[PDB]
Amino acid sequence: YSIEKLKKEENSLAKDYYIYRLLEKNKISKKDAQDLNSHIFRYIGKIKSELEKIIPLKPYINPKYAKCYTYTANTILDANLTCQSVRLNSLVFIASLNSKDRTTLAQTFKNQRPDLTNLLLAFNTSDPMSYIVQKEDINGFFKLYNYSKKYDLDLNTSLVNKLPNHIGFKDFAQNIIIKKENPKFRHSMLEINPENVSEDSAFYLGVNALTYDKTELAYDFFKKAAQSFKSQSNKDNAIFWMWLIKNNEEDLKTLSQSSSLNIYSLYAKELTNTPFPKIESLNPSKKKNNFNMQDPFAWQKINKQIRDANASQLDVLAKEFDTQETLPIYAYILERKNNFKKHYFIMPYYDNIKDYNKTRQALILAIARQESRFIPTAISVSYALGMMQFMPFLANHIGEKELKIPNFDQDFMFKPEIAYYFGNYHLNYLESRLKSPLFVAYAYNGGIGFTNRMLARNDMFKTGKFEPFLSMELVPYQESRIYGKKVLANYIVYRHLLNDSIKISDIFENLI
């Protein structure tokens, strides 16, 4: 597709993907590139660095404060007060000033903007964080953390209990807990009253408490998370921790009876001799319809309609797509139609994998369900492609260099036969080194590099009281932490559907 045909398609990730393929082959001239960032759905990462090689944009500076950005540290005292106050939004700018100019500006702004006064006078010390913490300036605390992570200080009970009322708290808490940074911040957060936190923050404060072996504080935080979390899946994770810590059998009972299918509810069912949850059976009689499952533009179109449809229009779409050929779209519609209530675990293009052993089948299907929901022309924001969501680098390495497929193009990843085949090949590579399907999942999502480095650590997937569950909470990238949990449930389920059951307790033992 040329830049002309693309310009006449709707903005979407597919169209971005194709513009990016033109850019990477140097087929976009400086003239084609004029009208172009209005043809881009998500102007972020490599498509934007590539377009800026051709047309390097300088904007944006808001036209009303333009004059404020003509001053420097050496001339800021010549600027009007509006200009002074705008420039002082930057802690780097404040750090650049000399110390008597910070004193001067601190007085100027003491009545009207004490927040600026506090930062100005804090940067006149050798420890700005210490100064801000003594004022209990909460906005300033978060501005300093974002300026530099290296500041670390003990925080008293009054101060830590104010932090959660600021929007930055949740990312701050998660980030220092899972990265194991800022030990003094971490230790201080033991004294946060569970009444003051909720949802993920509460959860991560329970994980924090466990790392300091404060099991009673942890329980209290996990209990608060269970009460406040919106998603049943997250509640279950919290209820599991409550159970593991204090061993109340009503917690486990509640968890065994969850409507969410996840590793926590699966495990609780297995410990209480509860039957495996009901998996829906989608068996459309109709063979095909008009829809091209190989057209990435048709998928982008129909996805947006599906996601924006009322309860009425979902019924019309469910009927249209109730066919074997469009089975992944049918299931996608039924997941939205039933408000995420029933359990769909389809096995499309099954002929391409029925000859692998059943364990491999289940891992392939588990990965695919998480990666794409089996959509053949799925495209991620980093332009990973097809059912098994291969980055183009890897797809080209396997297809051209290893399998020297005649006339391989990366868009072959949109073919089910190719996706499953390449997925099997890549999963052999990963499983041969990592063994556990959980670790394979982590490596499939985040690379074997990061997986091998996490597994090399002294404190990860070793023996302990609360292992391997604690380690699964401390996987250092949020996306991978979540991916692995999801893929593991899927794997358990697909092993069951294929009459190759395994106990999830065995999976957990093999993690240590």
Ligand X SMILES: CC(=O)N[C@H]1[C@H]([C@H](O)[C@H](O)CO)OC(C(=O)O)=C[C@@H]1N
For ligand X, the binding residues (CB under 6 A) are: 371, 380, 384, 389-391, 394, 426, 444-447
Closest distance between ligand X and the C-beta of residue 479, in Å? Answer: 8
Burial label, 14 (beta-carbon count in 10 A; 0-12, 13-18, 19+): buried
Taking the C-alpha atoms of residue 364 and residue 167, their distance in angstroms, rounded to an integer, is: 39
Among candidate residues 195, 194, 196, the one with its CA nearest the CA of residue 208: 194
CB of 403 or CB of 512, closer to ligand X: 403
Which residues have a Cβ under 8 Å from the Cβ of 421 and sit 6 or more positions away? 352
CB of 128 or CB of 446, closer to ligand X: 446
CB of 168 or CB of 447, closer to ligand X: 447
132, 119 contact by CB (below 8 A): yes
Closest distance between ligand X and the C-beta of residue 477, in Å? Answer: 9
Closest distance between ligand X and the C-beta of residue 384, in Å? Answer: 4
Strands, E, within 303-432: which ranges? none
344, 331 contact by CB (below 8 A): yes
Closest distance between ligand X and the C-beta of residue 73, in Å? Answer: 40
Q: For residue 282, how many other CB atoms are within 10 A of its CB?
A: 16
The DSSP string of 179-216 is HT--HHHHHHGGG--GGG--HHHHHHHHHHHHHTT-HH
Burial label, 64 (beta-carbon count in 10 A; 0-12, 13-18, 19+): exposed
CB of 258 or CB of 372, closer to ligand X: 372
Closest distance between ligand X and the C-beta of residue 389, in Å? Answer: 4
Closest distance between ligand X and the C-beta of residue 295, in Å? Answer: 21
Strands, E, within 239-318: which ranges? none
Closest distance between ligand X and the C-beta of residue 48, in Å? Answer: 17
The DSSP string of 390-401 is B-HHHHHIIIII
Residue 73 has phi, psi (to 5 degrees) of: -50, -30
Q: For residue 9, how many other CB atoms are within 10 A of its CB?
A: 16
CB of 3 or CB of 448, closer to ligand X: 448
CB of 371 or CB of 411, closer to ligand X: 371
Closest distance between ligand X and the C-beta of residue 489, in Å? Answer: 17
The residue whose Cβ lies closest to ligand X is 389
Taking the C-alpha atoms of residue 475 and residue 469, their distance in angstroms, rounded to an integer, is: 11
- CA 505, 508, 511 angle in degrees (round to 5)? 155
Which residues have a Cβ under 8 Å from the Cβ of 290 and sit 6 or more positions away? none
* Residue numbers after which the chain breaks, C to N beyond 2.5 angstroms: none
Identity (one letter) of the amino acid at 341? K
282, 373 contact by CB (below 8 A): no
Closest distance between ligand X and the C-beta of residue 263, in Å? Answer: 19
Closest distance between ligand X and the C-beta of residue 476, in Å? Answer: 13
CB of 328 or CB of 446, closer to ligand X: 446
Among candidate residues 201, 188, 255, the one with its CA nearest the CA of residue 228: 201
CB of 144 or CB of 418, closer to ligand X: 418
CB of 162 or CB of 397, closer to ligand X: 397
416, 387 contact by CB (below 8 A): yes
CB of 97 or CB of 353, closer to ligand X: 353
